[PDB]
Amino acid sequence: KKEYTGITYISGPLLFVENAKDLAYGAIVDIKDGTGRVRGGQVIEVSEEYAVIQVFEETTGLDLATTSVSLVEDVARLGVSKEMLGRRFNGIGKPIDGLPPITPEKRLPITGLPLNPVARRKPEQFIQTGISTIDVMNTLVRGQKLPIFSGSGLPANEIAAQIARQATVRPDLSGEGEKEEPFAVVFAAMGITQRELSYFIQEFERTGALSRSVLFLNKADDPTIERILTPRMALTVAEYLAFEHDYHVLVILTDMTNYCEALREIGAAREEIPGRRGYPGYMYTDLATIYERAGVVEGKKGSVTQIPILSMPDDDRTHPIPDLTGYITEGQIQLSRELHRKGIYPPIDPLPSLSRLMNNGVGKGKTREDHKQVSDQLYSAYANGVDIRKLVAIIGEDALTENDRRYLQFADAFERFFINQGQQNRSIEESLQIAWALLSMLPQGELKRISKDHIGKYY
Amino acid sequence: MIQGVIQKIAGPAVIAKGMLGARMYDICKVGEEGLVGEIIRLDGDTAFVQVYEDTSGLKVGEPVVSTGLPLAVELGPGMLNGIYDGIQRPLERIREKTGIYITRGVVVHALDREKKWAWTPMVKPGDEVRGGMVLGTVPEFGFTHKILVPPDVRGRVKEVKPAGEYTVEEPVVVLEDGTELKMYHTWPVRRARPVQRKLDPNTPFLTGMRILDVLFPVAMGGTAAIPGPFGSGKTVTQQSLAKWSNADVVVYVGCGERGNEMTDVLVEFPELTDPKTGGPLMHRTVLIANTSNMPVAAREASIYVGVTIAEYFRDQGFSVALMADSTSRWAEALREISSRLEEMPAEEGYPPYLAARLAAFYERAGKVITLGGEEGAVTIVGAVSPPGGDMSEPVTQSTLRIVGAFWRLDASLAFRRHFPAINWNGSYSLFTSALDPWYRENVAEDYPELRDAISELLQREAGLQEIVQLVGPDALQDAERLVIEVGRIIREDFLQQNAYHEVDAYCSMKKAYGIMKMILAFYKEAEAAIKRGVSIDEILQLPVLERIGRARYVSEEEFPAYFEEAMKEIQGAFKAL
Amino acid sequence: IPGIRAQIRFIQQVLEQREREDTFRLKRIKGKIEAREAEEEGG
Ligand SMILES: Nc1ncnc2c1ncn2[C@@H]1O[C@H](COP(=O)(O)OP(=O)(O)O)[C@@H](O)[C@H]1O
């Protein structure tokens, strides 16, 4: 096929064609030019007069005389299989590798089909990470999405690699099959530079966790609409390998800011009523469409859990990207530049980072009967210490009451021993022992959150 | 009736040509498959259908057929204890009919057409019947579900069915003019079920939370709004209002919420026990789920469906309690539809008819005496999500000036893990002056005076806290530091409540009044002792501090004695020294 | 006090800056709507 010639406009991303009504809305095309090089596209806003395309690669060398556009498929769909569990793809899905394409087993769409609110179940199992600021105060369970609000020069890739390497479930603390469950990473990156990509690949190759993970790469010297396409492919593969083959996947989505940028660029070139500070109106819809693809169903036993890394641009929690992401997901982890100055690692600010699906995955019979209570008390004491910091900065350190100094020293010990942990794999019990050691630095009877029984049993 | 073809399908909205005579808001069925939409335009001979589905994969030339009916619902027995979609599709049936996904183009009735019901005659052939009258009764599990005459209908009953067991399709009454009345009927959602006259609210809406019951009350006809940034608890508080209220029925509308947030209700509620009859709690809930990846016009569709169901139950005679979640999603749906219409937007893109819709939706809530001579009530608690937390968004402002209470959530109180994070000086209430007769009749006699004293103490301590932050909380006098410390004791022992304890999750009025009495008596005696000359450090080390502190983790049975013992102990120990 | 006044001045300048962009986009939208409706006599 070489039909549908007679384009009549080219400017940046877009490209128009004259009378063509048999192209279905949202189809896929391929744009051959006068020298054989074939590009890609996607039909938006079909109509009886013309039809607007959205080129993927670029628009260099396309003239208005020798240029055609042909139909490939009436809907976007990726050819998934199980043989793609050691491979490495790019953007749209060609293999950037020395091996031929795969022989598919089923080809499903990449757009949607949400889960039925009655075919779900509450995520309950508990997965520890070895980061005592996430195991003890911001619990991470299996079936929940939890971003990492990074920064410019703050270590977020290192924390993601550490979580991916240390994360393991604890079956012998609630009663389950002892040894059954490794993970399966579906790392999907859109916009990463060369340094960060080389770091990630080195790290994955050091631990041997590469022969059970798929890779979609969209490095920074590539087009942008491919960034618009990549995460849908990733989540399609993940949902397949979970709800069909009983795996437990862990999708790492990197730099959602570049995805939002490509979105804003196509919206601008479309002139579509900017919502708030640039970015168009439907960005909540788009981010939700690619976030809500991670849950757990009943009957099956697979699971899909996410960790979308994203760099809040100017360190503003009020920027539209972090704002909408926080409204959509359930939980968050937030790094701290001030703590990064003082050599702490991981510099996870423990105040503004919460997780919602925690009261159901922790408590008596799952980890230990005193977990959430130590959590509440540690939060209260740290808030008091932080306030007394400002009291000091107003008055002076020698005009302080005898217990305000206790709270101050608790805050400093907390920032120095509980948060800073290097690259070591802790345990829930070691971290709770450290937490109780710290909480014993304060006197008894001034902890109105814990019960007297636990107070007597641990101190 | 009127058939046309598609011309300009683009995004979530199409443009059908060859359609002359189509009304302005009826429901069309676009596409070769049926993708029910809605008309909002009429330009010469085309139309602007607004689809409620995906539209991914259509073409140009596929037919569109009008219906001439503006989005009715189905009102009758069978609604309680069930989920629905935005346009009233049973989620359970769709699940068992397709699988775990939600495909497009599924046709299922709203009310069941197979189960039998226990009819009971209530008329006599030859009587005169008018709209809203009673016709019979059908026992649903725990309630005596009535059946009614659709409004704007009258005649002379000719022959009724005797008792028995029928479906919802057998006409149980046959009027003389030939009109047959089923056990259900349809109602367009954008209208309002008429009444006789609207009464004045004079009884509270007990909800369990000490703050939202003692300080900022809401009458049993009222309205409210819980705005705040993400990470405050605009959902924990609404779920607690849904599981510890005093209403009869509850409708939980989710307009752009989380799938997990809506499935943690379908799983737990058929295990708890409603605090009025003992049955399961899922026998009074009609929740209407519409998550964040389903189609985009189903948002407004779901809001209107929920309000019409609540008004039906009010006309029946119960005391409903609507609960609309995140009305801001409605606003953003309207913004997208406007950006497709290509119109002129007001501030921040929101179309120039936002406030009208919100007012018309908030103004069908209140106690009323319907056409059968009974009483009903529809209370509304609509969450609001500002785009940065600022109370200057058009939705956050237009939702003032129309409501009663207003429960402004604060972010720092939610970072300190101090829940609930109700800011005690940005909120307000307007009902707290018509409920005093009810308080005097059913709680105590000087409960208004105790409430006034508590509020005055809080909102006088604030001024001293200003000077505290200026100078430091040590250059103050003794009475001033006493006021600061009493304020802190209040703030941590009477305005704090953990929704995950076993007995500190439902505090009643007598228990709240008891705690207030203890606090006031302690403050009085401490004032006297400070005048005497004893030191504030000893006054604070008095262990009645910890007694009246932990006095909230008690149950509700031994409190009438615990309170007496602690009261006498305070009165003794603060004159011992 | 002068530091707070400087902060206020900066915030006020940014808030006023982010209204002229809106007025500009609105005027362009109005121009496009006029250009389109100038061709919608019938069809
Ligand atoms: N009454 C409460 N008691 C204890 N914790 C609460 C209470 N309300 C909210 N929380 C905590 O605050 C968080 C708010 O959750 P959610 O309601 O989903 O977000 P939002 O309040 O922003 O809508 C929850 O994770 C919960 O742990």
Helix (H) or strand (E) holding A433: helix A428-439
Whether residue B213 contacts residue B399, with contact meaning beta carbons closer than 8 Å, is answered with no
DSSP string, A194-254: HHHHHHHHHHHHHTTTTTT---EEE-TTS-SHHHHHHHHHHHHHHHHHHHTT--EEEE-EE
Angle CA B520–B526–B528, to nearest 5:
105
CA of residue B60 to ligand 1 center, whole Å = 48
Whether residue A288 contacts residue B295, with contact meaning beta carbons closer than 8 Å, is answered with no
Residue B99 counted as an annotated binding residue: no
Using a CB-CB cut-off of 8 Å, the residues of chain C touching B345 are: 26
Q: If contacts are CB pairs under 8 Å, which of residues 478-517 in chain B contact chain A?
A: 492, 500
Resolution (A): 3.5
CA of residue B228 to ligand 1 center, whole Å = 12
Output the CA torsion B454→B456→B458→B459 (10° steps): 160
Q: How far apart are the C-alpha atoms of A285 and A216, rounded to whole Å? A: 23
Pairing of strands B138-140, B143-145: antiparallel
The counts of H helices and E strands in chain A are: 12, 22
Pairing of strands A168-169, A44-46: unpaired
Q: How far apart are the C-alpha atoms of B384 and B328, rounded to whole Å? A: 6
The response to whether residue B415 sits with its C-beta less than 6 Å from ligand 1 reads no
CA of residue A121 to ligand 1 center, whole Å = 20
Whether residue A144 contacts residue A114, with contact meaning beta carbons closer than 8 Å, is answered with no
Structure tokens at B561: 């004695």
C42 touches chain B (CB under 8 A): yes
Domain locations in chain A as residue ranges:
1-459
Helices (H), B434-551: 436-442, 447-470, 478-493, 509-532, 536-541, 544-550
Of B322, B386, B410, B397, nearest in space to B359 by CA: B397
Using a CB-CB cut-off of 8 Å, the residues of chain B touching A376 are: 417
Residue B374 φ/ψ region, left for φ over 0, alpha for ψ in the -120 to 50 degree band, beta for the rest: beta
Largest Cα separation within chain C, whole Å, is: 66
Output the CA torsion B344→B349→B355→B357 (10° steps): 80
Q: How far apart are the C-alpha atoms of A361 and B339, rounded to whole Å? A: 42
Our mutation pick for probing the ligand 1 site, out of A327, A356, A360, counting the most ligand atoms within 8 A of Cβ, is A356
* Residues contacting residue A206 through CB under 8 Å, at least 6 positions apart: none
Phi, psi of B46 (to 5 degrees): -90, -170
Q: Which of B341, B342, B350, B392 to mutate to test the interface with C (most CBs of C within 10 A)?
A: B342
Using a CB-CB cut-off of 8 Å, the residues of chain B touching C30 are: 344
Q: Which atom of ligand 1 is nearest to the CA of B240?
A: 1
The response to whether residue B496 sits with its C-beta less than 6 Å from ligand 1 reads no
Q: If contacts are CB pairs under 8 Å, which of residues 1-40 in chain C contact chain A?
A: 18, 25, 29, 32
Domain locations in chain B as residue ranges:
1-71, 72-114+182-429, 115-181, 430-577
10 Å Cβ neighbour count for C7?
A: 10
DSSP string, A125-141: -BEE-S-HHHHSSS--B
Helix (H) or strand (E) holding B301: helix B298-316
Residue B232 counted as an annotated binding residue: yes
Of A237, A218, A224, nearest in space to A55 by CA: A224
Beta bridge partners of B379: B321
Q: How far apart are the C-alpha atoms of A202 and A161, rounded to whole Å? A: 11
Residue B234 counted as an annotated binding residue: yes
Report the nearest-CA residue for atom 9 of ligand 1. B233
Phi, psi of A424 (to 5 degrees): -100, 150
Structure tokens at A55: 């080129």
Whether residue B195 contacts residue B370, with contact meaning beta carbons closer than 8 Å, is answered with yes
Our mutation pick for probing the ligand 1 site, out of B213, B236, B408, counting the most ligand atoms within 8 A of Cβ, is B236
DSSP string, A369-391: TTHHHHHHHHHHHHHHHHHHHHH
Using a CB-CB cut-off of 8 Å, the residues of chain C touching B17 are: none
B:C CB pairs within 8 Å: 9
Q: How would you label A351-367 residue by residue, b for 16+ Cβ within 10 Å and e otherwise?
A: bbbbbbbbebbbbeebb
Pairing of strands A94-95, A89-90: antiparallel
CA distances from B275 to A229, A275, B240, B250, B554 (A): 51, 45, 13, 13, 19
* Residues contacting residue A351 through CB under 8 Å, at least 6 positions apart: A379, A382, A383, A386, B415
Q: How far apart are the C-alpha atoms of C9 and B250, rounded to whole Å? A: 50
The reply to whether residue A122 touches residue B56, judged by beta carbons under 8 angstroms, is: no
* Residues contacting residue B576 through CB under 8 Å, at least 6 positions apart: none
Of A17, A22, A21, nearest in space to A6 by CA: A17
Breaks in chain A after residues (C–N exceeding 2.5 Å): none
To the nearest whole Å, the CA of C8 is away from the closest chain B CA by: 17
CA of residue A155 to ligand 1 center, whole Å = 29
The reply to whether residue B344 touches residue C42, judged by beta carbons under 8 angstroms, is: no
Whether residue C22 contacts residue A276, with contact meaning beta carbons closer than 8 Å, is answered with no
The reply to whether residue C25 touches residue A277, judged by beta carbons under 8 angstroms, is: no
Helical packing angle, A283-291 and A256-270, nearest 10°: 140
* Residues contacting residue A235 through CB under 8 Å, at least 6 positions apart: A251, A290, A293, A294
Q: Which chains touch A (3 or more CB pairs under 8 A)?
A: B, C
To the nearest whole Å, the CA of A262 is away from the closest chain C CA by: 20
Nearest C-alpha in B relative to C30 = B344
Burial tier of A207 (Cβ tally within 10 Å: 0-12, 13-18, 19+): exposed
Which one-letter DSSP state was computed for residue A417?
Answer: I
The response to whether residue B505 sits with its C-beta less than 6 Å from ligand 1 reads no
Whether residue A74 contacts residue A24, with contact meaning beta carbons closer than 8 Å, is answered with yes
Structure tokens at A79: 């050819």
Whether residue A360 contacts residue A435, with contact meaning beta carbons closer than 8 Å, is answered with no
CA of residue B264 to ligand 1 center, whole Å = 14
Angle CA B149–B151–B155, to nearest 5:
60
Q: Which atom of ligand 1 is nearest to the CA of B414?
A: 12
Q: How far apart are the C-alpha atoms of A362 and A373, rounded to whole Å? A: 11
Whether residue A228 contacts residue A163, with contact meaning beta carbons closer than 8 Å, is answered with no
Phi, psi of A397 (to 5 degrees): -75, -15
Q: How far apart are the C-alpha atoms of A35 and A88, rounded to whole Å? A: 29
Structural biology method used: cryo-EM
CA distances from B195 to B198, B364, B367 (A): 8, 11, 11
Helix, strand, or coil (residue C14): helix
Which one-letter DSSP state was computed for residue A91?
Answer: T
Whether residue B340 contacts residue B13, with contact meaning beta carbons closer than 8 Å, is answered with yes
Structure tokens at A270: 């479309």
Of A111, A106, A140, nearest in space to A125 by CA: A140
The one-letter code for the residue type at B424 is W
Q: How far apart are the C-alpha atoms of B52 and A368, rounded to whole Å? A: 48
Q: Assess whether the previous peptide bond of B151 is cis (omega < 30° from 0).
A: no
Beta bridge partners of B50: B13
The one-letter code for the residue type at A89 is F
CA of residue B417 to ligand 1 center, whole Å = 9
Whether residue B525 contacts residue B574, with contact meaning beta carbons closer than 8 Å, is answered with yes
Structure tokens at B470: 């200026």
10 Å Cβ neighbour count for A125?
A: 18
Report the nearest-CA residue for atom 13 of ligand 1. B233
DSSP string, A285-338: HHHHHHHSS----SSS--EEEE--EEE-TTS-TTSHHHHHHHHHSS--EEB-HH
Report the nearest-CA residue for atom 17 of ligand 1. B233
In the block, which residue shows the tokens 């050091």? Answer: A206
Nearest C-alpha in B relative to A316 = B388
Q: How far apart are the C-alpha atoms of B270 and B243, rounded to whole Å? A: 11
Q: How far apart are the C-alpha atoms of B137 and B147, rounded to whole Å? A: 6
Whether residue A240 contacts residue A108, with contact meaning beta carbons closer than 8 Å, is answered with yes
Output the CA torsion A20→A23→A26→A28 (10° steps): -110
Q: Quick one: three-class SS letters along B172-230?
A: CEEECCCCEECCCEEEECCCCCCCCEECCCCCECCCCCHHHHHHCCCECCCCCEEECCC
Helix (H) or strand (E) holding B289: strand B288-291
Whether residue A114 contacts residue B291, with contact meaning beta carbons closer than 8 Å, is answered with yes
* Residues contacting residue B562 through CB under 8 Å, at least 6 positions apart: B551, B554
Q: Which atom of ligand 1 is nearest to the CA of A355?
A: 25
CA A43 to chain centre: 29
Which one-letter DSSP state was computed for residue B426?
Answer: T
Whether residue B473 contacts residue B465, with contact meaning beta carbons closer than 8 Å, is answered with no
Using a CB-CB cut-off of 8 Å, the residues of chain B touching C42 are: 44
Q: How far apart are the C-alpha atoms of B27 and B38, rounded to whole Å? A: 5
Q: How far apart are the C-alpha atoms of A108 and B258, rounded to whole Å? A: 25
Pairing of strands A148-150, A333-334: parallel
Q: Which atom of ligand 1 is nearest to the CA of A354?
A: 25
Beta bridge partners of B134: B148
Residue B233 counted as an annotated binding residue: yes
Helix (H) or strand (E) holding B98: helix B91-98
CA distances from B74 to B290, B301, B308, B344, B376 (A): 18, 14, 10, 36, 20
CA of residue B233 to ligand 1 center, whole Å = 4
The response to whether residue B233 sits with its C-beta less than 6 Å from ligand 1 reads yes
Q: Is the dihedral of CA B99, B105, B106, B111 positive or negative?
A: positive
Breaks in chain B after residues (C–N exceeding 2.5 Å): none
Which one-letter DSSP state was computed for residue A39?
Answer: E
Taking the alpha carbons at both ends of chain B, their separation in whole angstroms is: 91
Q: How far apart are the C-alpha atoms of B75 and B509, rounded to whole Å? A: 37
The response to whether residue B208 sits with its C-beta less than 6 Å from ligand 1 reads no
Our mutation pick for probing the ligand 1 site, out of A324, A354, A379, counting the most ligand atoms within 8 A of Cβ, is A354
Of A288, A298, A215, nearest in space to A251 by CA: A215
The one-letter code for the residue type at B481 is R
What percent of chain C is helix, strand and coil (3-state, nearest 5)?
85, 0, 15
